[PDB]
């Protein structure tokens, strides 16, 4: 079978971030959000040198509008809501 | 000033899988692995319809060779070792 393993390099990679209840309202979170999750960029990957974690050099903040759908003990309510996404744009292997 | 959110669609996306101790040896976890992690494909993303999770239609197994470095008490030993990677190649929203 086998073939030779390639290290996951330290770079920015598309990930899926779920938009949680706590991010808009903790108080008895009896409501929903659309969309329920968005793509983001994060650093991930391993480092060649010993004792260097993969970490972000440059993070971009990106606010985005969603909808909050409150089950108002009976009837849907559609409010707009903004959430701020933290995108990584570059990575470096940096010391512990 | 905000802009309009785009749903993360149900598709295959490059992810980073860490190669753990238990995958080669639970009994003695006094050793290391190179590389420490590899890229894989997995399904991720949300579904448009109600009560449909994003899940894989086709998974590919892919065996890969790494090195196990045993601290044999004071002295390194380099053994080759194969690990099997599970790659997703297509996704569907399923109940």
């Amino acid at each position, epitope marked *: 079978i*086998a073939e*030779p393993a390639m*290290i996951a390099e330290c770079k920015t990679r598309t990930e899926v971030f779920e938009i949680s209840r706590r991010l808009i309202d903790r108080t008895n979170a009896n409501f929903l959000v659309w969309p329920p999750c968005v793509e983001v960029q994060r650093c991930s990957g391993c480092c*060649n*040198n*010993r004792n260097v974690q993969c970490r972000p050099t440059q993070v971009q903040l990106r606010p985005v509008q969603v909808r909050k759908i409150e089950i108002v003990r009976k009837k849907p309510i559609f409010k707009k809501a903004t959430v701020t996404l933290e995108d990584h744009l570059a990575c470096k292997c940096e010391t512990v | 000033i905000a802009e309009p959110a785009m749903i993360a669609e149900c598709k295959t996306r490059t992810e980073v899988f860490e190669i753990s101790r238990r995958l080669i040896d639970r009994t003695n976890a006094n050793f*290391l692995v*190179w*590389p420490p992690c590899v890229e894989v494909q997995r399904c991720s993303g949300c579904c448009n319809n109600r009560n449909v999770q994003c899940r894989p239609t086709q998974v590919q197994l892919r065996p890969v*060779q790494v*090195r196990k*470095i045993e601290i044999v008490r004071k*002295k*390194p030993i*380099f053994k*080759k070792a194969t690990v099997t990677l599970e790659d997703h190649l297509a996704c569907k929203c399923e109940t």
Partner: antibody
Amino acid sequence: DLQLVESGGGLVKPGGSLRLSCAADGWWFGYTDMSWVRQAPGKGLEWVGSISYKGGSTYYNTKFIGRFTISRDDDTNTLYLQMNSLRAEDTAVYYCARDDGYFDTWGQGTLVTVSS
Amino acid sequence: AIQMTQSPSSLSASVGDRVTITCHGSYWLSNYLAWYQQKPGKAPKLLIYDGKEREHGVPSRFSGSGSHEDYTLTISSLQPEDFATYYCQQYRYHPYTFGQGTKLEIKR
């Protein structure tokens, strides 16, 4: 497989001095002995020397004991060969290699040409 | 040092032939021997190590044997892509020592 890349070679006047470096992808480098091996144009392979895991020890081929120093940087995953009082004899491709008795990983090599 | 004596210095062999290359040491080696193939221009590739162990990804036809002083690489069914120069290497005692090499030509 494991990567190794030698550099530091080229053209050098006789009597001169030169440092070769050999760089390795990956921290595995810190966990292995490392040898240098040379080979003159159209001739056989010749062990140059090795260095132990932690730096503990160095080992050399007699022909070379006076002239060459093997040094190792466990942070950069780099292996180094210091070469002094060079002569035509030393015109060779110089290999980096992973010493475990039996050298399972090789650089491509770096050509040293000794000539004025 | 221990002197490695490979034989023969050079040879031609037709496609399909069985071929043997022999390496002889000045002392008893106990399988602290390995075999390399090396194409023109390129680094050596490890074929056999510990006298008889094949390396992952080395074709079935390459075969290691020997004990004590006397060791053998055997290429069973010679393939045109096997043209190379082959070396043995002792590693029972420092300094490491190699053979003078065997330059293998394919004959046709």
